[PDB]
Amino acid sequence: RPTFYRQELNKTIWEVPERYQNLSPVGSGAYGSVCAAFDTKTGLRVAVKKLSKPFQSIIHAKRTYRELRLLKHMKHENVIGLLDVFTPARSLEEFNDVYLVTHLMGADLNNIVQKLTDDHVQFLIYQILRGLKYIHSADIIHRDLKPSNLAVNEDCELKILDFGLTDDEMTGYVATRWYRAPEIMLNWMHYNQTVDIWSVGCIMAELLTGRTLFPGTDHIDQLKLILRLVGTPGAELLKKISSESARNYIQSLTQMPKMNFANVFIGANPLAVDLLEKMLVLDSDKRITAAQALAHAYFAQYHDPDDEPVADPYDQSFESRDLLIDEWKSLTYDEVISFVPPP
Numbered sequence: 352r353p354t355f356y357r358q359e360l361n362k363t364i365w366e367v368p369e370r371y372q373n374l375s376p377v378g379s380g381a382y383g384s385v386c387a388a389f390d391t392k393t394g395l396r397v398a399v400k401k402l403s404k405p406f407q408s409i410i411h412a413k414r415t416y417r418e419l420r421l422l423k424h425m426k427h428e429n430v431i432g433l434l435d436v437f438t439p440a441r442s443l444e445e446f447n448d449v450y451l452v453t454h455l456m457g458a459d460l461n462n463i464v465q466k467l468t469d470d471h472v473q474f475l476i477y478q479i480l481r482g483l484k485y486i487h488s489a490d491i492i493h494r495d496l497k498p499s500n501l502a503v504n505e506d507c508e509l510k511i512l513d514f515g516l517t518d519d520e521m522t523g524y525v526a527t528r529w530y531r532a533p534e535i536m537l538n539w540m541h542y543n544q545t546v547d548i549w550s551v552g553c554i555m556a557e558l559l560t561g562r563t564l565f566p567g568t569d570h571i572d573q574l575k576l577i578l579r580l581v582g583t584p585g586a587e588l589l590k591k592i593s594s595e596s597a598r599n600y601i602q603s604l605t606q607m608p609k610m611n612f613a614n615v616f617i618g619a620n621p622l623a624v625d626l627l628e629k630m631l632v633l634d635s636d637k638r639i640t641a642a643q644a645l646a647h648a649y650f651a652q653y654h655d656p657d658d659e660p661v662a663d664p665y666d667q668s669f670e671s672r673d674l675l676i677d678e679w680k681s682l683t684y685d686e687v688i689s690f691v692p693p694p
């Protein structure tokens with residue numbers, strides 16, 4: 352057990368091992384209770400997240416467990432993983448705080464991008480897909496990929512944040528919804544991991560043009576923006592919309608053909624255009640996968656199939672489990688105590 356020291360920061364008492372020095376709040380509120388710090392043990396600038404009231408309810412205790420499990424599994428250059436996890440508690444009895452440690456990045460993709468060069472788009476999208484291939488290989492879905500949870504350092508090296516984890520914040524003219532695949536935005540069906548490929552398409556388009564692809568003013572306005580670009584669904588896809596209510600609304604819409612992406616993305620690399628066409632497909636069954644996308648000619652200067660690793664299997668059976676607060680807490684505690692730092 353290291354020696355811990357106390358400090359008041361984000362209106363709360365942070366108790367961290369001595370190795371972590373110069374703690375300073377970052378993005379006040381945006382990422383939660385997060386401090387930047389210097390890790391004297393590794394020489395890395397780190398981000399430390401203190402979990403807010405982790406075992407307050409069953410739902411909170413389970414998502415604390417969920418976040419720790421997810422962060423513990425991810426070991427990839429392009430995915431946020433866990434450098435360290437600690438609690439000041441000496442036993443399960445006094446266990447009530449969880450601190451997570453990962454790399455400190457420079458900024459997010461939002462406050463860095465306006466229309467980029469094709470070479471920068473290539474590199475940035477390649478890294479997203481490299482990390483996504485890894486995530487998807489573990490049968491994990493990100494679900495909420497957007498520029499604000501893609502973090503970049505000064506070398507343009509990229510890591511994905513917030514993978515696998517309210518109605519009001521999805522309402523209106525909001526970036527929280529602009530990158531969502533239509534089938535998840537309107538709950539058409541049980542969705543696959545290519546909801547994340549849709550998001551990549553939206554992100555890639557924005558890097559290339561400097562403009563939000565589908566900046567809808569609400570769910571419906573956004574759907575119309577989407578269907579204008581990609582066309583209205585045919586009979587084949589309509590069958591796959593198990594939501595009879597959602598299916599019925601779609602059929603009320605005036606049919607529209609898919610637009611010419613070369614006339615939408617004027618001046619862009621024809622290989623970029625082709626890839627966008629394969630990512631931004633209405634039917635999720637027919638979207639390109641991350642592994643397929645990495646082999647696309649657009650990424651010829653970066654692609655290396657021996658340097659695009661996959662993940663170990665990820666047991667998420669706990670998701671189907673109904674446990675008590677103290678049971679989720681004990682499982683969380685086991686995971687903290689059993690943590691082994693990377694080499």
Ligand SMILES: Fc1ccccc1Oc1ccc2c(-c3ccccc3Cl)[nH]nc2c1
Binds near residue numbers: 385386422456
């Ligand atoms: F603090 C964290 C610990 C473990 C997992 C995730 C955590 O959340 C963040 C939140 C923001 C982070 C940043 C960051 C730092 C400055 C500007 C933007 C960003 Cl995304 N670098 N690393 C981060 C990690």
